[PDB]
Amino acid sequence: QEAPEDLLERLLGEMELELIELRRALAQTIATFKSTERQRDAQQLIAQRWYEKAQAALDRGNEQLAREALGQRQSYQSHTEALGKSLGEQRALVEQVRGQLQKLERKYLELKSQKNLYLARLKSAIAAQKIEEIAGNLDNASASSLFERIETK
Amino acid sequence: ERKYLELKSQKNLYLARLKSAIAAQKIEEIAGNLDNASASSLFERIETKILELEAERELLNPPPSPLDKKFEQWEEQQAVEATLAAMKARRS
Amino acid sequence: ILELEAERELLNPPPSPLDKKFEQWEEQQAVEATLAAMKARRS
Amino acid sequence: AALDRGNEQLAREALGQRQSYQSHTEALGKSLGEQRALVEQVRGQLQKL
Amino acid sequence: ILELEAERELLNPPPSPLDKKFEQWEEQQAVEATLAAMKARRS
């Protein structure tokens, strides 16, 4: 149990620090995301080189040898598909994440737009009671007010 | 070994999503509402406190009576017309 | 992950199907109303 | 100028693009309306006080 | 290297496909408008 107003600043103090930490990691997933993106492209090219051998595999006029290379690439081909699909799901998966962050930050600012506004009104009334309470009256007639206290004396 | 790498490809991916929602609950839970109307949210807590003193000050000093303001403004209106009588008096 | 996913949703009710339906339709009416501006300004 | 090309299709995207801002414009435009008279009440207190 | 690459991008949203598309088209219209100046000044 603390002052409701004072904890607000501390609350918003940790508010942004936690928010930024998220922003740091979001790029982290994207970086590795492209890392595999390149990785897939590397393997298919290797198949293309294997395919390039296949294209010239018959330059000798022999169809037999081409068979081994065509069977050789297939191991990669399945690996190509295996990894190719893997990034497909992640593609829209992160995109959903971005909507959260952009949507979320816009919310924060609207809060701060009022953060100080309430405080001023708080001080506006804090004095207001303080002023007139101290200035309750000058002719109280009961000696409770400071002025009448002197008057009776 | 080929198996191991596929694991790491997702190792960090789950962590980011974990942090993605960890804040998400943290943010909106802290930002549950601004007009809660129940004093549970931090904003409304302040709102009620503002009004708490508002009437507190009013009790310490009775405000003008409707008749008092009504005669006061009417007295001004009579003053307005009386000044308006001066308007006619000085102009004509 | 899913544990908190719905946890957050409960703390804040999501848009009603009618709300989004009118919201997008209102945009569509705005689209057509802006489309009326399209015709209004072009012709 | 979206129709300067004579194409009405492209103008549609831009007209749909702004609407996001348009609601944001109204969202913030109203926000300051209440505060406008809200502070004014405050000033009367201070000068009166 | 890639870690910061996207880090910078998030801190500043890049151009929208429509923005670049209108931007280049606006240039193309400027190109044609300048091309209109080409015809205007040459003929």
Ligand SMILES: Nc1ncnc2c1ncn2[C@@H]1O[C@H](COP(=O)(O)OP(=O)(O)O)[C@@H](O)[C@H]1O
């Ligand atoms: N218009 C007025 N003319 C003369 N006295 C007034 C007037 N209004 C209030 N008072 C006096 O102010 C007093 C109230 O002052 P306060 O100290 O707040 O309460 P208390 O009188 O119980 O000490 C009343 O007792 C009353 O006699």
Ligand SMILES: Nc1ncnc2c1ncn2[C@@H]1O[C@H](COP(=O)(O)OP(=O)(O)O)[C@@H](O)[C@H]1O
């Ligand atoms: N659209 C709305 N307009 C006004 N008040 C709302 C709206 N949505 C929610 N609220 C208020 O927010 C409160 C819920 O805030 P919360 O603190 O999470 O629960 P509780 O009200 O039990 O404290 C509700 O009591 C309700 O009055």
